[PDB]
Structure formats: C-alpha cells, structure tokens
Amino acid sequence: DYIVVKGAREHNLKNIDVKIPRDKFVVITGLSGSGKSSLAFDTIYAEGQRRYVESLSSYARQFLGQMEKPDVDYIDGLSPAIAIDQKTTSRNPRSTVGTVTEIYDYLRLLFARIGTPHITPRMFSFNNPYGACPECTGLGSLMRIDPDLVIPDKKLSLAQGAVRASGWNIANDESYARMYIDALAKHYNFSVDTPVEELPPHILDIILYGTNGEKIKIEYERENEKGTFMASFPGIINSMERRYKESEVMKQYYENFMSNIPCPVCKGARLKKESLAVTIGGKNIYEVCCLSIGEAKEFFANLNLTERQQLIARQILKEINARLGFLVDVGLDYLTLARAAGTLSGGEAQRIRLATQIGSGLMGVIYILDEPSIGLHQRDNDRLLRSLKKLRDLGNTLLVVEHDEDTMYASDYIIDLGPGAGSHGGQIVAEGTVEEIKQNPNSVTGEYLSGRKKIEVPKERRKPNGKWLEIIGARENNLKNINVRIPLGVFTCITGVSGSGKSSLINEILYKRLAAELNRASVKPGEHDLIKGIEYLDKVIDIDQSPIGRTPRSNPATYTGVFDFIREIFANTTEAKTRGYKAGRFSFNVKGGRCEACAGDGINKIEMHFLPDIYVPCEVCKGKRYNRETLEVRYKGKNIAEVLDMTVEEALEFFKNIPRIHKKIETLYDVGLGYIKLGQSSTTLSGGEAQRVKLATELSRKSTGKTMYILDEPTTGLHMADVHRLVGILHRLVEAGNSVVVIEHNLDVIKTADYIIDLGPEGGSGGGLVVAEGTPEEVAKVENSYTGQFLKKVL
Amino acid sequence: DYIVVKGAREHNLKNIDVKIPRDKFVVITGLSGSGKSSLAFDTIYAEGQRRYVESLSSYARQFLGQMEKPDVDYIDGLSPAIAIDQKTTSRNPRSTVGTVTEIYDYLRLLFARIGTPHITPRMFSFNNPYGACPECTGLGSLMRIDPDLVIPDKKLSLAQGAVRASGWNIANDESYARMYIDALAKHYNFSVDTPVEELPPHILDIILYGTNGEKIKIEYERENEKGTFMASFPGIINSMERRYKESEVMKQYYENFMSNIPCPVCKGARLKKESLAVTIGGKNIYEVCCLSIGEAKEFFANLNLTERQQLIARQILKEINARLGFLVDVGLDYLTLARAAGTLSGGEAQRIRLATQIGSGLMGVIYILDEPSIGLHQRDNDRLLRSLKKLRDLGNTLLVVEHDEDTMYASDYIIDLGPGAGSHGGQIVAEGTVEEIKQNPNSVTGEYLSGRKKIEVPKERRKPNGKWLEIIGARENNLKNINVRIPLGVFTCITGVSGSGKSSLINEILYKRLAAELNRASVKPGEHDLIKGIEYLDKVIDIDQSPIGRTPRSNPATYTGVFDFIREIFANTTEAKTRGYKAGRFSFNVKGGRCEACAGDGINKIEMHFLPDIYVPCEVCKGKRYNRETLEVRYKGKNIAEVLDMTVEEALEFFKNIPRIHKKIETLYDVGLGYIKLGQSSTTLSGGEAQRVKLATELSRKSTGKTMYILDEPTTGLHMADVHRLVGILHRLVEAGNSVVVIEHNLDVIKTADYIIDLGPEGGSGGGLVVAEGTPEEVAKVENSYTGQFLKKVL
DNA sequence: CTGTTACGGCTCCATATGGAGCCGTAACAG
DNA sequence: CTGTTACGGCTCCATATGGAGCCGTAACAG
Ligand SMILES: [Zn+2]
Ligand SMILES: [Zn+2]
Ligand SMILES: [Zn+2]
Ligand SMILES: [Zn+2]
C-alpha cells in the first residue's frame, strides 16, 4: 500500500529515496527548478504511462510511440496514471464543452425519452449525418477565406504583390504557381501585369475558384528540362481550403485568413430543422444548451412531470443533476453548454477535465496535477479543495503540485524538495505531517508557514503623475460598454472573479492596440471606440511562458547580451593578438572556430536500420563544440569551454573586475537564476527560466521612462520566496521609471500593489463593469467586493 | 466494490443486467456465439480503454483514434483494463524475448556492476549505437534479397519475364519501370530482348545496384504528353530495400524475397566485440542469453560471489530470481532469452505477456483473458491456475473467458450466458457459486459438470487399410532426425508437451510438401529427406480461423453453394418466365438486378468536414440491396430479400420439398450454425463461424475417399457441446472415406481418436523424438508418458 | 564608449496504378 | 443431372521548396 521509489537519478536528483502513502492527499512543494516537477512528471507519470502502454495492443503502442524509460532503479506498487495540466486543446470545431463534459449524450437521451414532438437518440446528435444540418454539415459556422483579405488592394496589379498568402506568391518566376497563372492567362487571353481592377470578372472567378472541371495543357520549363502536360486548375481558394482541411502554427495562420460567421440556415444550432421542433418545458435542445450552468441546473431542478415520466427517466435525471452539481462545485458556473472547446484558457480547461474525471468515477488511478489553484480567484479555493477531497474519498490518490499556503493545511502528507535549486537542490529535505514541517527549521516552506519570514506591507505608496490612459467604448466579448482609466508610472494590478473579462479586456484590446499603434503590428484589435493618451508610451513588451528559442543555436549567455563582451575580452588577450585572430572566431555559430565535423552542435546523427535516429555526443571534439585550435587560447587560466560551462555564481565571482559584464551578471543573479549554466540550450528551458531570462534582459537595458509592460499570471508555478523576489524586481522596475500592468490573483502580489482595478461582480454575462478602483485601502473599505473583503481581512 | 452494468444492448444482448464482484476470480462461460465474447470485449474492455484514453493527452488520443462508445446505459466502478489474447506480433527484429520480458535491462545492470573485464550499462545495450555491432547495426542477421530469386533463370531474356517481383515487371510497355530500363539500356548500348546470360556484368550490376550516384536523362512518353527529365537510377535491389524499410501481408511478401543469415562479424550477438569480452562465472552475456530458462535459473542460483558483491547487487539478484521463477511457473521453461519475438505462437505470446504482467506488479487493473488454457498441455494447467491465483491475490480482478472444466472449480463467480446462440441466446441464465450452477438444471454447463450428459467412449475402433504415409529424415527446427508413420483412412490425433515440435513438424513439413506435390504451391518446404506414400492422396485442405472473405460482397449463402440453386428456382417461377428474366438477375453483384444507387451494397458514403466518412443505410432502396422492380417477383409468398433475411432453421423448414437444396441446408444446420442468417456479411464472421462454414462446405462436396484434412487446435473457443458436435462431425467425415489429422490438447478429443502419436518427452531441444504411438490403450499402458498417464486416468 | 537600426546568413518546420482474392458464366466430361 | 475447369469482371490494399525566428556584423547617432 506504499509507492516506494529507490534510486531516482533524473535531471538534478541526487539518488533520492522516497516513500509516498497511497489513497491519501499528498502534495509536493519546492522552489522553482528544485526538481519537484521533474521528480513527479518525468518519473512517476512517465513510468505509469509506459507500463500501461507496454501491456496494450501493438498497434496502439506504435501509434503512441516509444515512451522514454526514466532513469530509475525500480518502482513498486504503481497504478496507471493520468496527468492533468494547463494545455489548451484547440482540436476541432466539433468538440464543445457539452461533449467534453459528457452531458450532451444524457441530454439527447432525455430529449428522446420525454421530449414531446411539436424521436430517436441518434437523431439529436450533430456528430452523425442522420440529424446534422445539411448546409453547415454540423459545424454551425460557415467559415470561408475572405476574398478581400487575400487581395487587399484590387487596383494594384498581380505582379505588384496582390496575393498576400504563403505558397501562392507570384513574385518568383521559378515558382510553379507563377507558371500556372501565366498559362491560365494565356488561355484566357489576359496579361498578368494587368491590374486586378481592370481584370474581367470571369478571369478573376476562374483564378479564385478553379476551372470548374475544365482541363488545359500547360508546358513546364526547368533548368535543363522541358515538356508539356495536361491537367486542371483547382483554384486558389479551393487549394487553400484543401490545405486547411489536411499542426498548430499553420492552422492558426490559415484560420487568420478565414472569417467565422453563423450559419444562415440553422442559426448555428448544428442540428436539422425538424430536430429543433422537439421541446420540453417550452425550450428546445439549443435553448437549454445556450443557458449557463446555474440557470440550466435551476431549470432542470424545477421541471414538472408526471409520475410515469419520472419513473421512466429517474436515472437520467439523477445523473444529469449529479454532473451539473459537480460542474458548479468545481468552480465553473458561467460557462455555456454550447461554447466551443477551442476558446478556453488553461485553468478553465484543467477545471473542466477535473470535473469530467470526478463525474466519471474511475477507481485505482494515480492523479497528477500541475498547480490547480492558479488562474482562479481565492473565493473558489474552498470549493476546489472540497472537490479534490471528494475525488480522493472515492478511493483514488492525489499528487498535487501546489504552492498555495491554504492547500498545505488540507493535505495529509507533504514532501519538500530543496534546499536551493539546480545543482544545489535536488534532495529531499523534510517530509511528514504539516505540523512537523511547520516545526522543522531546515525548510524554507516551514519558516514561511510559521510566520518567521513574510512579505511586509509597504508604508509609502507612489502617486500618478497626471498622465492617465483612457479606454472608451470597450465592448469586446462580454464587456458591457464600460470605460476604465489606468494610471502611468505606477505598479498596476487588475483582479476579479474568474472569467470576468479582465483577461480579454487586457490581451485582446490593450496589448493589441498598443502593438498596432507603436510597434507596427498587423493584428486586428478588439471592439473599442478610441484610446486616449497613446502619446505617453514608446515601447510595449509582453512576457509569457513561451520558450525564448526554438533552435539549439541559442543560450541565455547570448540572449542576455554578455556573449559579445566575452568574445571581445577573449580576442583582446595577448595570445589572440599574437595569433592575429578575430572576435568572431570564439563563437559556435560561424565557420572558423566551431568544430567542423559536428558543425558546432556537439551531436552527430547515427541512423539505425529499424530505429529512429539517435544523437550521441561528438567524438571528434569531445562535444565541446569547438576545435582544438581555438582551445589553445586561454585567458586567466580558463578557456572558452570552461567559461561556457561555468555557473552564474562562479561567473559573478570571477568577473568582478569588469564592470561592463558585472552589470549584466548582477542582474542575472538577482532575477533569480542562481543555478543555470550559460551554455545551457534554450530548448530545455522551462517557463520559469524563460520568464526570468526575459525579465533580466528587460532590466539590463537602460530605461528612458516611457515603457509599459503587460504580463499575465506571473506567479504560475512559483514558490513563496520566488514571489517575494519577483515583487521586489517589479518594484525596482517601477522605480526605474516604467509602468507595469499584471493580472495576478495571488493576494501577496495584490496587497503590495499601488493601484487596484476590480472587474465583476460576477462571472460570465452577469458581470463586466468596474466595481471599485483606487488605492488598496479604498478597495478594502468597499463592502460589495470579494477582493476588497479579502484585502481587508489580510491587512 | 461492485461492477454494475445496467442496460447492455451490444450485438445480441437482450438488455441484460449483471453485477460482477471486484477483486475476485470471475469467469464467464457460454456457447460459441452466445454473446459472452461480445459482452466482455465490446462492452467492458472497450469502455475502460475509451475512459482512460479520453483523460489522456490530446495528441495521444488522436494517435489512438476515436474508440467507438458501446451501446450501454451506464457503467460504474470501472478501472482501466488491458486485454490479453492470442494475437501474433511480428513487429521488428529488434524486439526479442529478453526485452519483452524486461529481463535484459537487469542482466545489463548485473553485468555492469559485477562483470569483471577480460563497464557501463549503456554499453551492453544493442538498442543504442554506443555498444552495437558496427556491421549488422545490432540486428545480428544480415538480411538481403537473394539476387538469384528475382531472376531464377538467367538464360531467359528480360522480355520473357526474367523479373519475378511485383512493381518491377517489364511486360507492360506503359510502365515507368520499362521506360527506365529502356533508357538505361540505350545509355549503356544494350538491348532489352538480349538474354541476361549474354548481358555484360557491368550492365547487370548497374541494373541491380543503381548507377552509384550517376545522373542520366530519361524521356517520358504519355498518351498526349511528352518531355525530358534528368534523374538518377536507384536500382532494383535498393528500391526493394527502401520499400521494405518503409502492414503485414506486404512485409511477409518482401521477407519471402530476402533470406536471413547470421552476421559474419559478431555471429549474431548484436553487440560489439569489445562488449563480449566482459564475463561473469566464465560466461558472457550472449552465452547466458542463449541458454534455456531453467538452465539460466540454475546457473544464477548456483553463482558464487563474495559478501561485498552480494551486498552491492542484492536487489538485482532478487528481481532476476523472481522474474525467472515467474517465467518458469507460468508454463514456459524451454524458451531461449535470445529468440526473436516474431517466431512465436499465440499461446506462447499470451503466456509471455501474462508473465511480464505478473512480474511488473500493477495494482487496480481489470484483466481480460481470452481462453488462456488453449495451446497448453494438461500437465501445466495446475501451474497456470497457480499463476492466475497469484496474479489475483495481489489486489487485481480477473475476467477469464475459459471453457475448461478444471478451471471452473478454481473460480469464485461464474456468469453463464445462453440458453442457445445468436437470437436464441444473449441472456443471462444462471450465476453464482460452483455448487449453485452445478445444481441448476437450467444451464447446459451445470448439467455437463454434474455428469448428466457426457461424451461416451467408442467401443469399436477402425483399423488402417495398409496404405501408410512415411516421413524420412525430418530435421526441421528442433527435430532430432526421427521417422514417423501416419496411417490413412483413420482418425489421427497428435499430442505432446507444449513446444515439443509437433506444430512445426505438421505445418512446416507435411502441409507444405503435400501442397507442393499435389496442388502445385510455390512454397519452400522444411528439411526432409523423402516422403513415401504420396500416391495415395489426391486433395489436401487446411482449416484455420482466418476469415473466408475480405469484402462485403460475400456471404455464407453464396459460399456454401446454395445461392445458385436459389437463383435458379427464383428464375424458374411463372412470373420470372412471363417477364423473360434470367437466373443472373436475382443477384447483388451484377448489373441489372441490384440497386443502381448504392451499387448493391446497401450503404452510402457520407463525408463530413472534420470527421472520418460514416456509412449510412441507403434510403433509395431501403437497404434491401435490390431495386423495387426485382422485388415485384414473389415465390411462395416470399421475395428474395425475405429469403436472404431468413435464418437457417426457417430455411430448413421451408425448403423441405427441394432435395437438392435440403442436402446442403441439412449439412449447414448439423455443422452447428443454427443461428446465423444467410445474408450476413462475411467480414463480421468470427473464427468459429468461419470454421463451421468451411467444415460445412467441405462436407457438402462429395468425397471420393482420397482426401486428407489438416487442422490445428480446432477446439479454440468452443464449448463442451460444441466439442461433442465437432467430434461427431469428424467421425462422420472419417466414415465418409477420408482421413483427418488434427492437433488437439483436449482430453475429450484424444480419448475418442482411433490413433495417437506422441512427441516429447520434454519441450525445446530436450525433446524431439517419438515416445509412443498406436492405439489409445497401448499409449495408456506406457508409463513414461504424460499423455498416456492422463489417458489411463480418464479411462 | 553605448545604444539603435538595417542587412546577410543560418536552421527548423510546413505542405495514381498494380497485385491478390472472390463471384459469376460458359464449356466439357461422366 | 452433377462435378470440374477455364476465363472475364469486380473490389480492396499497398507504395522537394518556401516561410518564420534568431545570431552575427556593419553603419549611424549621441
Ligand atoms: Zn447550419
Ligand atoms: Zn565535434
Ligand atoms: Zn554483427
Ligand atoms: Zn440502394
């Protein structure tokens, strides 16, 4: 009844031995990068998934690929595990909230059994051709590529760049598209250089919609080849639609070309017109699915029926009521049962998955969670804890990677990693009951819980300088035409209930408009009337969890900007001058200094007969990514490889005599990155490391006092000490002369902010108007505000 | 703690309600096709797999596809489930028994830790390039296509059909291959019609191995297109190898072209020569892995080492000993740890998977088994039962679909379906303890267990007619050069221990030689000297579980041969003669009578935008697969659709007045097919239905007394009544004048056979010689024979 | 010296025809 | 009448080039 793990050597784990009780609420806490996330995800979930897959069918195993076996000696008492995290799934327009939560089938059964006609369960489904809309094929949206978007200027000629779509540009004469267009124009007696405005409608229709089955002969010309062939032109729009039907970035780029409109026939009901005639209680399936969760639950609880109907559909009603109660208890009460699954956030998706899992009721399954208390306001923390306890009580086990102090008191076993991070961390410090870790002086978390060290409340708060940004006519999504006023040069925090519209109001309006008006970004903004005060800003920077580099040719050393100084000081040594070298030779991205065999990568491709290609360290240069000639030059007893393999603390200690490098190294050390190596590849960097690198790069560059920063949930997967460092770095950034706007639900970040904007008072269509604004004390004095009440309670 | 299933409507289930206890040994028994297999596999395992998949990652779910949701109201208390059956997995040559059983990693760890050099775990692995053989790339077998096989006769010219490979024939002048060959010949100054024997060696080398990077210009000619292009010829062998590297039938066909030989460098060790130098106890890794399981266990138990080594590798030794004990206890003790996983039978693969699962030790997982007692001799039934009990005891649940009487006594809960099969069956009859079902007179299984009805022992046994088949120099696989003598015209049964070589000796020798010498089959036989008595046989027929038709255009009605008579009698009616029709019009595979809209299929393709195409019954002809014009003709108040939708019993009752149809219908009814419909598609037919159809077709055709039948495990998934009917049908076939040879481990089939041949006395290389032969009483009198001892005990 | 801007070079990711088995039909022999 | 054999017709399965983001370098201004 114990999960005993002996000999774990993944990432930075120093051969730890841990025993975790089963069928109990167990949480794991540690610093950012200390190794808790690796020890959980890469070891336990990976081992469980691989063990379950190896026993499945051969074709299923091949489809799922070969999962990497973790470097662990032996693990016993392991059950199949499923991991729930914040990973949005755009998927397909077919999937909605109703089908994901597994309630649409029950609604179909109820409508078929009881719903009187104005009658089969298969008829009501939009996933089958039996009862789908003939026009939209069940999608409910007539999505087509906008003819005006592909050719924004019809007056401009085709050769001038009329087409603005990838894979269809006619600028290059060597492309097959240009030859096809020329052949079509020759067949239709037209010239390519003729402006589209002067082009006949028939020619434009043929170009944009194919030849309607007509076949023509087009000759092809190559470098040394020639000939003739006969085929049919499919059309630009037809080819684009086929490619879209046949990845995420490419799908998003293609969807940007097209526009989504409601289907004119069924008005986006995804069902046949005859099927909508069936009604129960005066409402059909579409009206029921278009209401919120709370209203739907109230309607179902207040439904009137005879004894025979209740006896016929007792179990259906019980199951629907239980599922709706679980959905309203997990923390969601504003969602609509018809909203597409694509338009959701990470927290909402994770909560929906948790609700589906608890409603389904699986037994003997290990559950892995990744910070479930993020993206949600503090008013639903009790509901989330109750739902998690209910999930645990049925006979499962929970491994919640949570950092909130409230979650610790509700846990039965706490495993704390540390003491530091990276090389310093990776060992188990203390474990046991919450009281034991509270009384344990060897852990930072226990000291924080006991109140030994906490975040103090600032005494002096800055005031706006008089330059205030104004928003007029904000109506994006579920905004009820409200006007807000954000000050400048002051740390600004925006709070509100989950799904109140603050995230949309920020991301889809403010950042997009600022980018379009300042950085010249071709992004369509949201619905707004006008923005006042745009002249007071010069640069806009957005910080997210996306990796800083998609290629292994980048590293934090070159991203921060210290690599140029390192190369200059290496080339300025006596040996380099004697050899007549250059500052560009000490790099692993140009020819001359990097290893020629491995092309400055350190890994060579070793292809196997029946195995995917496996990369091994290069043996020509021992994986140092530098030839032996360059390593002959040494500065202060160290070579370039030693510097690149040297940690940040050692770099700070060694480079104290060079102020122009020490300035950036101090920023890198203070931002929180005290364990990474300068030579670490950017691909393996996690979200926290990327955010820290971006913050350090932003802080390093001098500030002119006219910059604004837009963030989103900056405390995602950060320990309390990490929050205490981040608030200090944000205060330093504000004091530098810039303005920072963040969206954080953490009370610690809010209690220290110099300006609070509240959106509510309820989620969904119920809210959308400003409740209170101003100083934190003023918001606390407000009675009708959850955020104000919590601010008053904490202070 | 209960698995409650309410409202199951899959296949032929009549809305059954079943409750199954958890964490207990539960078996399900029913007649062939009664619905037990459907109720288990299509409902419980499918629901568990879909439930687990829906909670996994989106990409994993897409890779695994969308599993069909079973037609069940609601199921509660379901754990993730894994299904183990007899499905061969050829996979790749990389996978062997050692890596499947998960013992090669432990062997590598032991060798790295203790094995003294003549030292890293990654070095000993053949799945990584670090310590793989440079020549064979870790395969251990240099498999190449035989140059002589593609051109068996070099004297014959290329135009005469020199190439015998699909996709490379030059008979068609319009093929691109012929044009490429002609261009190469023109470049090399040679003629295609020239014989290969007269072809220069350089030309043949270029043709069979490409141009070694040379580029030439080849001109293409089309129906109305022409031109020139430049490319490089890759070569016939290179293209074949690339296609083989890039399915099962195609892979087998390609492997037939090639031959497997040991690697000359490492002698098929799959490891580098330096790696083989490390030895422990005087043996290296290859010698240890080349020994049998029992010898390896004895060697490991008798290994001598100091206290320090034992302390260092205590857990490794314990795990290896436990895994070897489990492997020797499940029922396998003759396998070699280096044999490829491809060369295994279904029962051996299932037992290996069960051993791996019990060794791994998963908790809270539903286990589904498909007749685990088949393919195994009765002497290991106790070992299999003990292994299953050990698997159940650790905290899992078992759902074993077993028919053996011995397995019933070891079960704790029995769910019996019936009472008949097909439409008659599909309902739960009785359930409970063994005593309750034994005392229940409403179940056939209880009556059989109580001894109310049993299989009697025949009193008179036939004798050979003097024409005896002789086998000389049998040396295939693990045969120790023994000679056997099989009589003719007498029911012959071959028994032996599991993996004694009887299956190989039959399939790879007797059937292949008979097919080659009689039916002109181009199949390479096994290693044999000569076969005597081949002149006494005329036809050879093999019966297996393979489906009889891969297309929905076939059905048992047309496979048996009664459809021609049905069409003739339909066309002979007065209305057909008046209309001037023909006997070919009443068919669903020719033009004129079948529905033109659906092309006589009854289903139309409805393509969706973002969903795989879903087939829906045709509405033009209501899915009757016949136009309204043909249905106007009625015979005896019934139309052709009614006849095709009429069951076998009703057809027998109705068609009693036509002897030429009644003769085949009586055979179909007596073979055991009393529930299927004549119009049922052949694709949905299972193994038992296909075997019954084949047996009925064979029995229907008149016998000249010069035919031999070869079978294999005919009692796979057959109830006791099914066995009692099959033995009667086999005795009828023998009395008809033919000879039947079967390989059955069931004691009931053996005790009634008129001739018994025993192979043993042990599995693997230990056995291979005939132990006893002759009458069953003579075999029983033999003391040193497990089969003889069991025959004496039962009699 | 220090910051900004423009350009060159680089890598990673994205987008129809032949063979085998079966059914129906005609001819031939008993 | 009944079995065998040959052939025609049918269906299912199988086999390289352009764009986006980043690093390095030169020129210009303060
Ligand atoms: Zn529609
Ligand atoms: Zn190298
Ligand atoms: Zn080799
Ligand atoms: Zn039809």
mmCIF file with all atom_site columns, N, CA, C and O in Angstrom, chain A residues 355-375:
data_model
loop_
_atom_site.group_PDB
_atom_site.id
_atom_site.type_symbol
_atom_site.label_atom_id
_atom_site.label_alt_id
_atom_site.label_comp_id
_atom_site.label_asym_id
_atom_site.label_entity_id
_atom_site.label_seq_id
_atom_site.pdbx_PDB_ins_code
_atom_site.Cartn_x
_atom_site.Cartn_y
_atom_site.Cartn_z
_atom_site.occupancy
_atom_site.B_iso_or_equiv
_atom_site.pdbx_formal_charge
_atom_site.auth_seq_id
_atom_site.auth_comp_id
_atom_site.auth_asym_id
_atom_site.auth_atom_id
_atom_site.pdbx_PDB_model_num
ATOM 1  N N  . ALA A 1 355 ? -13.511 18.142 -13.542 1.00 0.00 ? 355 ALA A N  1
ATOM 2  C CA . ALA A 1 355 ? -14.935 17.889 -13.354 1.00 0.00 ? 355 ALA A CA 1
ATOM 3  C C  . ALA A 1 355 ? -15.376 16.642 -14.109 1.00 0.00 ? 355 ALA A C  1
ATOM 4  O O  . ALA A 1 355 ? -16.140 15.824 -13.582 1.00 0.00 ? 355 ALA A O  1
ATOM 5  N N  . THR A 1 356 ? -14.901 16.477 -15.344 1.00 0.00 ? 356 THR A N  1
ATOM 6  C CA . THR A 1 356 ? -15.228 15.276 -16.103 1.00 0.00 ? 356 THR A CA 1
ATOM 7  C C  . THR A 1 356 ? -14.701 14.027 -15.406 1.00 0.00 ? 356 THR A C  1
ATOM 8  O O  . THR A 1 356 ? -15.401 13.011 -15.320 1.00 0.00 ? 356 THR A O  1
ATOM 9  N N  . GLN A 1 357 ? -13.472 14.091 -14.887 1.00 0.00 ? 357 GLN A N  1
ATOM 10 C CA . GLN A 1 357 ? -12.888 12.931 -14.222 1.00 0.00 ? 357 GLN A CA 1
ATOM 11 C C  . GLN A 1 357 ? -13.655 12.562 -12.959 1.00 0.00 ? 357 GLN A C  1
ATOM 12 O O  . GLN A 1 357 ? -13.912 11.378 -12.710 1.00 0.00 ? 357 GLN A O  1
ATOM 13 N N  . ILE A 1 358 ? -14.029 13.553 -12.144 1.00 0.00 ? 358 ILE A N  1
ATOM 14 C CA . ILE A 1 358 ? -14.765 13.238 -10.922 1.00 0.00 ? 358 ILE A CA 1
ATOM 15 C C  . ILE A 1 358 ? -16.165 12.732 -11.257 1.00 0.00 ? 358 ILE A C  1
ATOM 16 O O  . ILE A 1 358 ? -16.691 11.838 -10.583 1.00 0.00 ? 358 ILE A O  1
ATOM 17 N N  . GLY A 1 359 ? -16.788 13.279 -12.304 1.00 0.00 ? 359 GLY A N  1
ATOM 18 C CA . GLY A 1 359 ? -18.097 12.790 -12.703 1.00 0.00 ? 359 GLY A CA 1
ATOM 19 C C  . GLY A 1 359 ? -18.059 11.366 -13.224 1.00 0.00 ? 359 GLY A C  1
ATOM 20 O O  . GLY A 1 359 ? -18.985 10.586 -12.988 1.00 0.00 ? 359 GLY A O  1
ATOM 21 N N  . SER A 1 360 ? -16.993 11.010 -13.945 1.00 0.00 ? 360 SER A N  1
ATOM 22 C CA . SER A 1 360 ? -16.888 9.662  -14.496 1.00 0.00 ? 360 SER A CA 1
ATOM 23 C C  . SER A 1 360 ? -16.750 8.622  -13.390 1.00 0.00 ? 360 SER A C  1
ATOM 24 O O  . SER A 1 360 ? -17.453 7.605  -13.389 1.00 0.00 ? 360 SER A O  1
ATOM 25 N N  . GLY A 1 361 ? -15.849 8.859  -12.440 1.00 0.00 ? 361 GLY A N  1
ATOM 26 C CA . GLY A 1 361 ? -15.710 7.980  -11.296 1.00 0.00 ? 361 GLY A CA 1
ATOM 27 C C  . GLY A 1 361 ? -14.811 6.780  -11.515 1.00 0.00 ? 361 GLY A C  1
ATOM 28 O O  . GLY A 1 361 ? -15.239 5.638  -11.326 1.00 0.00 ? 361 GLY A O  1
ATOM 29 N N  . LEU A 1 362 ? -13.566 7.020  -11.916 1.00 0.00 ? 362 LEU A N  1
ATOM 30 C CA . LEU A 1 362 ? -12.596 5.943  -12.047 1.00 0.00 ? 362 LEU A CA 1
ATOM 31 C C  . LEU A 1 362 ? -11.988 5.608  -10.691 1.00 0.00 ? 362 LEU A C  1
ATOM 32 O O  . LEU A 1 362 ? -11.852 6.468  -9.817  1.00 0.00 ? 362 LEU A O  1
ATOM 33 N N  . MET A 1 363 ? -11.617 4.342  -10.521 1.00 0.00 ? 363 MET A N  1
ATOM 34 C CA . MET A 1 363 ? -11.077 3.843  -9.265  1.00 0.00 ? 363 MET A CA 1
ATOM 35 C C  . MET A 1 363 ? -9.668  3.306  -9.475  1.00 0.00 ? 363 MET A C  1
ATOM 36 O O  . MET A 1 363 ? -9.363  2.726  -10.521 1.00 0.00 ? 363 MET A O  1
ATOM 37 N N  . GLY A 1 364 ? -8.817  3.500  -8.472  1.00 0.00 ? 364 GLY A N  1
ATOM 38 C CA . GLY A 1 364 ? -7.457  2.983  -8.522  1.00 0.00 ? 364 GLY A CA 1
ATOM 39 C C  . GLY A 1 364 ? -6.593  3.597  -9.601  1.00 0.00 ? 364 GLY A C  1
ATOM 40 O O  . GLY A 1 364 ? -5.873  2.874  -10.302 1.00 0.00 ? 364 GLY A O  1
ATOM 41 N N  . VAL A 1 365 ? -6.644  4.918  -9.753  1.00 0.00 ? 365 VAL A N  1
ATOM 42 C CA . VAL A 1 365 ? -5.864  5.630  -10.758 1.00 0.00 ? 365 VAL A CA 1
ATOM 43 C C  . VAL A 1 365 ? -5.089  6.743  -10.068 1.00 0.00 ? 365 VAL A C  1
ATOM 44 O O  . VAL A 1 365 ? -5.660  7.505  -9.280  1.00 0.00 ? 365 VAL A O  1
ATOM 45 N N  . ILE A 1 366 ? -3.795  6.832  -10.358 1.00 0.00 ? 366 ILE A N  1
ATOM 46 C CA . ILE A 1 366 ? -2.956  7.892  -9.808  1.00 0.00 ? 366 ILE A CA 1
ATOM 47 C C  . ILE A 1 366 ? -3.230  9.183  -10.567 1.00 0.00 ? 366 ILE A C  1
ATOM 48 O O  . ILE A 1 366 ? -3.185  9.213  -11.803 1.00 0.00 ? 366 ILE A O  1
ATOM 49 N N  . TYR A 1 367 ? -3.513  10.254 -9.832  1.00 0.00 ? 367 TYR A N  1
ATOM 50 C CA . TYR A 1 367 ? -3.821  11.552 -10.415 1.00 0.00 ? 367 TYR A CA 1
ATOM 51 C C  . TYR A 1 367 ? -2.653  12.501 -10.196 1.00 0.00 ? 367 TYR A C  1
ATOM 52 O O  . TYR A 1 367 ? -2.163  12.641 -9.070  1.00 0.00 ? 367 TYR A O  1
ATOM 53 N N  . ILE A 1 368 ? -2.212  13.150 -11.270 1.00 0.00 ? 368 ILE A N  1
ATOM 54 C CA . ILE A 1 368 ? -1.121  14.117 -11.225 1.00 0.00 ? 368 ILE A CA 1
ATOM 55 C C  . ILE A 1 368 ? -1.685  15.472 -11.625 1.00 0.00 ? 368 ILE A C  1
ATOM 56 O O  . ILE A 1 368 ? -2.283  15.608 -12.700 1.00 0.00 ? 368 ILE A O  1
ATOM 57 N N  . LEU A 1 369 ? -1.493  16.470 -10.768 1.00 0.00 ? 369 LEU A N  1
ATOM 58 C CA . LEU A 1 369 ? -1.999  17.813 -11.001 1.00 0.00 ? 369 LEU A CA 1
ATOM 59 C C  . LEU A 1 369 ? -0.846  18.806 -11.008 1.00 0.00 ? 369 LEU A C  1
ATOM 60 O O  . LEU A 1 369 ? 0.142   18.641 -10.286 1.00 0.00 ? 369 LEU A O  1
ATOM 61 N N  . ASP A 1 370 ? -0.981  19.842 -11.831 1.00 0.00 ? 370 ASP A N  1
ATOM 62 C CA . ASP A 1 370 ? 0.052   20.859 -12.014 1.00 0.00 ? 370 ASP A CA 1
ATOM 63 C C  . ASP A 1 370 ? -0.533  22.214 -11.625 1.00 0.00 ? 370 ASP A C  1
ATOM 64 O O  . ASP A 1 370 ? -1.092  22.923 -12.465 1.00 0.00 ? 370 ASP A O  1
ATOM 65 N N  . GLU A 1 371 ? -0.389  22.570 -10.345 1.00 0.00 ? 371 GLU A N  1
ATOM 66 C CA . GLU A 1 371 ? -0.845  23.842 -9.793  1.00 0.00 ? 371 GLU A CA 1
ATOM 67 C C  . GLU A 1 371 ? -2.318  24.082 -10.106 1.00 0.00 ? 371 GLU A C  1
ATOM 68 O O  . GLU A 1 371 ? -2.643  24.935 -10.941 1.00 0.00 ? 371 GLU A O  1
ATOM 69 N N  . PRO A 1 372 ? -3.236  23.352 -9.466  1.00 0.00 ? 372 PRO A N  1
ATOM 70 C CA . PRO A 1 372 ? -4.663  23.554 -9.759  1.00 0.00 ? 372 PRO A CA 1
ATOM 71 C C  . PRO A 1 372 ? -5.217  24.865 -9.231  1.00 0.00 ? 372 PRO A C  1
ATOM 72 O O  . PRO A 1 372 ? -6.300  25.276 -9.665  1.00 0.00 ? 372 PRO A O  1
ATOM 73 N N  . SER A 1 373 ? -4.517  25.536 -8.315  1.00 0.00 ? 373 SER A N  1
ATOM 74 C CA . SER A 1 373 ? -5.010  26.756 -7.689  1.00 0.00 ? 373 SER A CA 1
ATOM 75 C C  . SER A 1 373 ? -4.518  28.014 -8.396  1.00 0.00 ? 373 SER A C  1
ATOM 76 O O  . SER A 1 373 ? -4.452  29.085 -7.782  1.00 0.00 ? 373 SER A O  1
ATOM 77 N N  . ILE A 1 374 ? -4.173  27.910 -9.676  1.00 0.00 ? 374 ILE A N  1
ATOM 78 C CA . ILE A 1 374 ? -3.742  29.057 -10.464 1.00 0.00 ? 374 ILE A CA 1
ATOM 79 C C  . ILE A 1 374 ? -4.811  29.358 -11.504 1.00 0.00 ? 374 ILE A C  1
ATOM 80 O O  . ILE A 1 374 ? -5.527  28.464 -11.972 1.00 0.00 ? 374 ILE A O  1
ATOM 81 N N  . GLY A 1 375 ? -4.935  30.638 -11.849 1.00 0.00 ? 375 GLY A N  1
ATOM 82 C CA . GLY A 1 375 ? -5.978  31.084 -12.744 1.00 0.00 ? 375 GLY A CA 1
ATOM 83 C C  . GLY A 1 375 ? -7.348  31.192 -12.115 1.00 0.00 ? 375 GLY A C  1
ATOM 84 O O  . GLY A 1 375 ? -8.321  31.463 -12.831 1.00 0.00 ? 375 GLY A O  1
#
